Amino acid sequence: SHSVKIYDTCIGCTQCVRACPTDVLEMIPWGGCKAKQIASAPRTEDCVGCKRCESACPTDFLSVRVYLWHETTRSMGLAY
Amino acid sequence: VVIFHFSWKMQSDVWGSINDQGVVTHITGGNFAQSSITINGWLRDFLWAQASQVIQSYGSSLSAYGLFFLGAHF
């Protein structure tokens, strides 16, 4: 499945989790930023690779990174 | 393809010059039946043959069409 990583530049705006169409991102508690929360990708087996999360990250540079990897039935978006 | 069909059909089987005695010679010599059943015929007996006027229009009042030909290619 595609690899997804979260870097500590994240500010905790929870925008990558809202844009995700397959529920791959989560918001866990953290102590690094002001919102006391950082993102994590515990369900990349359902990740399709749309990079809709990267389109919504306000960090420069991005804090969500989607590295397209080995394609599976779930990652290819097949209903058949 | 529709308009090329129209052009070749009209220039081959209709449009032409009529004699005083009733002899009609079309703009192209009825070449539609034998030439248009082939892609090479469409390339040669239609494009290569009828583009002569536009590639020879320089120095005449039709030279603007010769310029637009190449500009549209561009």
Add this chain to the structure above:
Amino acid sequence: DIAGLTPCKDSKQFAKREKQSIKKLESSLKLYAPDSAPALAINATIEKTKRRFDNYGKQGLLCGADGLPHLIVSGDQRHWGEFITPGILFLYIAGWIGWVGRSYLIAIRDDKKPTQKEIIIDVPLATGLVFRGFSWPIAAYRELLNGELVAKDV
């Protein structure tokens, strides 16, 4: 002459082109009446053709075997009117355009919305800057020596 070319005043093909062009226009002229407006138009084109060929042959243009003026841009002083002189004129005009536009961008870069004066031109500011390009080779050269033309460390 140069590169095996012959001056157009000496070339026979050059004079044959002038003949055939004028005779072709005259062939179009016989179709119309001597008092007609197409006649005066074709006569004016013939006179304009004679003027063009005569001017090309008078200013020392070199002709090839085709009877067409070939230009020599090597810098030979006999043909500076073919490139170097009009090129210096261009570089003067091009530098004028670039320098005036640059002066405009510098003047509006400190505005509250610099993009506002880029899509809606400040014509008063433009009219005051259009004539600074007249002395652009000087104002640019001084800005070169004073370190004002190039942004430091970019």
Add this chain to the structure above:
Amino acid sequence: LWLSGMYFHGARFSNYEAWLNDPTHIRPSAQVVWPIVGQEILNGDVGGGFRGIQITSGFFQIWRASGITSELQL
């Protein structure tokens, strides 16, 4: 406005009155170019003592079918 331009060019810069007397030999023309950079070559011999650009819009046929004769009506 476009139709106004069409009828006005048929009235002012055209040979419609000449095409009306010999419709089979005259070429319909309604645009005449200015002589500036040699483009007057595009003012070709269209017949009826006229140098212009042959038109294919067919306004001459329409104006004849409607009964228009003089430039004043256009």
Add this chain to the structure above:
Amino acid sequence: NLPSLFVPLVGLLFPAVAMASLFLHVEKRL
């Protein structure tokens, strides 16, 4: 006479055997 034997042997029999064998290997599982 030799073209009448080798031309079909490389344009018909060879691609037939090659495409069928490659199909079996590509679709094979372990």
Add this chain to the structure above:
Amino acid sequence: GFTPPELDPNTPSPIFGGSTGGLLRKAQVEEFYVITWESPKEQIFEMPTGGAAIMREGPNLLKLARKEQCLALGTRLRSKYKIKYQFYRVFPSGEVQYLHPKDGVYPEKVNPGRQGVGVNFRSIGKNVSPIEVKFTGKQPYDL
């Protein structure tokens, strides 16, 4: 501590005439998904696969072919209407796997019982050059 609701079969399904965007052989031999929601009344809702269906009053069960179809329908159930929803995965063996909302809390809301997965503790530009991971099964972002 949270306990996911078990999937209850024989739960009513919305009124629908049928469409060609439904399940295929993937549901038979690979996997399929099932979304459930409560709803207050009988309504009409656009199907993520075809046209429109009549959402039954009370518990609703809807089987789809992809997970993204479930979350998309759930998001619309949460926006247009005000309906909570869960969805699961169903393998051909009959096993059911709870998916979303995982914690019972929506993923956009921080929850204390969640662990970090794939969280790199450096700037994104601090990754290494690919030569430093050459001939290894590593990537400059897996670390």
Add this chain to the structure above:
Amino acid sequence: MRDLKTYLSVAPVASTLWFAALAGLLIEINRFFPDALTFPFF
């Protein structure tokens, strides 16, 4: 009035007026000095 002058200063209108004046000037230059492959005044 001030709004009308601000509209005339927009990029397309300023471009048309500027390029129309430029086109007319070059046309008159090639009208009083047609052809000319060279700079004849030396």
Add this chain to the structure above:
Amino acid sequence: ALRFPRFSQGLAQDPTTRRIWFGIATAHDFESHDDITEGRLYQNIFASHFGQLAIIFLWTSGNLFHVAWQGNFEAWVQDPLHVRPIAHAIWDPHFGQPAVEAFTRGGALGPVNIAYSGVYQWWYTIGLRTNEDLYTGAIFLLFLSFISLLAGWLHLQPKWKPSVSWFKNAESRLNHHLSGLFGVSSLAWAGHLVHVAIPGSRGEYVRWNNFLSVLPHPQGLGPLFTGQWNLYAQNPDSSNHLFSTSQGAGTAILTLLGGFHPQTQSLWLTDMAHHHLAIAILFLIGGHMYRTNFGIGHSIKYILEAHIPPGGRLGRGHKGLYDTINNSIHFQLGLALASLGVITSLVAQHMYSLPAYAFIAQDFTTQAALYTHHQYIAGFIMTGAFAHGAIFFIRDYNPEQNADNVLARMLEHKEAIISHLSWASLFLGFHTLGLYVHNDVMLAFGTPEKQILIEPIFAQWIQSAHGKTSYGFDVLLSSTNSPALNAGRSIWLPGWLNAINENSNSLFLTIGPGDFLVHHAIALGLHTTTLILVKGALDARGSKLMPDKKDFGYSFPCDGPGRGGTCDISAWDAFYLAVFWMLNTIGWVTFYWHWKHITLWQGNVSQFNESSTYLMGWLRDYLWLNSSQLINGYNPFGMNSLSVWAWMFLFGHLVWATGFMFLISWRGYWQELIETLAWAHERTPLANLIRWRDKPVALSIVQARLVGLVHFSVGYIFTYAAFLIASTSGKFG
């Protein structure tokens, strides 16, 4: 592993058809395969080299076999200028009777294709005379292909596979390549010329049976060990000499005449033998530069470390470049492809102007085909050189080990390099197009005298500098007083000046304003193609838009629609865009070459000099006019031997236009379409008893760009090859 491809698990675990495609497209990318090491990398490369050599030997072996079997070589030697050489025989059961009739030519029993590679002239000039000689060479190359496979297999078992340290022995490899591979081979080729080719060119058939008895020179060997080498140049062949005979034959074996053999119009066979001997011994001495196991020589590392200008205008100079290249096989392949593409274009420019094979200058179809072939080959090689330069920057470039040397400084001012390449392409494009349009408008308005025809006076001055009189600039070689002329009158200048001013050959053809405009289009094509490849190679590790591109690899689809859109942002896409410009550039180059020669061969150079100055002349007087016999290869009234080109002509138009579909239309449309087709199959009776074992999906975005580019390139090459050969061989002149 578990299934195809066994080298990639992620591809093997793909449930869709994408598993097959990517398994084929990544078979040779050894560095991406699972469990690869530096040893296995160099070893697979080594064996692949042997397999390639085996391919080349087998290919040449087959060419000899057909020329000797179904060809005309024995009959062609008797009439070099009146026999059409035969490639092979045609056996197509789809032929009608007239197709058999029209294709039977060259003096054969069945339908045959007329060879246009020039191997007949090549083999006749080197001494091959009978079909038996060609059979002997084919067996030897078939045997050489066998031992190539033998060595490839040999170095794949343990104790024969070398260590990566052996591959990284650059000093020893350069010494042997310069001494043995370059020099000794050229020395032995000079030996073949002075033993078999030159005596074969004088009527003496020297073969392996009698080469031990004949003397290459009457007073052989003796003078070579004395220093009186000039005795080998005393009696050349007369200017009235026939190649296969002895009337006018001499006895010299090493000369420097400089011109052509008047009959064959090819270079002097003695000049070529002396040439190879001189460059060989120059390679032999040059191959002793670097240090090995004898305590003398240079360390290429130390030479690179010492070349650092004080003042630091190049920073740390070339420090670290040794290990940077010796550890990166992509760097080495980039340099190899760059140098090979340059000398490939060098071969193209010299084989048409300085023909070295007898009776090949009159075979106009062969000259046009050979020049076009090598120029497109060189164009692809140049695109690959820059492609692997970008691949090096991503996969192998270590920024810390190249700190502040020339290589890192290229990245440090990437914007300067890319912007100026852009300015030069803009300048050339704006003006070259503008001048062409100006002349087009002038000739439209019937005023040719108003064109802007600039004289290519700088290249004319160079041609006069070589002794050409057509421009009369009175410089060296063209002026009687210059010492460059006096120093060479004794040697090469007689034959050289005799050939350059001959109005039949193409040694420095006469150039006019049309050639000035085309050469600037060439400059536009070179500059823009360089711009694309360089911007991609420098922005391959990162950009302001994607500062971490190096993490995503060389070839990836994109980075998503975010940040404005990032389509075609990888360096692979830069290569993919540059191939269109490469094809366009080589198209301009070859359109230029073919038109100038096809008007020269027709004796009508005025049509080119007057019509190449405006683009309507290129469309009308070149493509349209020469396509006549081609497109009439088959008409409603029959066909001739040119029909195979009329068909391939349209075939190339189809493949090319098919590539537009892959390049214009993109993936998501076809994925949804395939979904609607998968439903159709599952719901259709009878057919649903057949189940696909790989899920149907649309082609990948990168795969689509590649497939579209391949269709575009194949159609490009095949369309022009069909027109080129049919328009030239249809006239044969």
